[PDB]
């Protein structure tokens, strides 16, 4: 049984709040098709000195699959906003970090 990836690509990362949140920003939704050929949500951007960033696991471009194991698919960019906000204080994330298609 294999625990252990050759390349790791998806990853689950707990995160706690800070004082102005977990410390990204997201774009995309099901309604922002336009995003991505690749509909989800996604970070657009760590911030400074945040939660995220002194963590240092999540990246931009991070596809982010389900917060404490809620799939994100299928949600509009408000409701997924929403349930950011609703997740408390420690929070977790699975993420499928970047990866291109040539
Ligand atoms: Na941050």
Known sequence: ????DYLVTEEEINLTRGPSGLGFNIVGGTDQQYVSNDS???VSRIKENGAAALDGRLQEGDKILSVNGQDLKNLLHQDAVDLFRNAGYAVSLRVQHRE???
């Open 1 to 4: 049984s294999m625990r252990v």
């Open 40 to 42: 989800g949500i996604y």
């Open 100 to 102: 291109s298609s040539i």
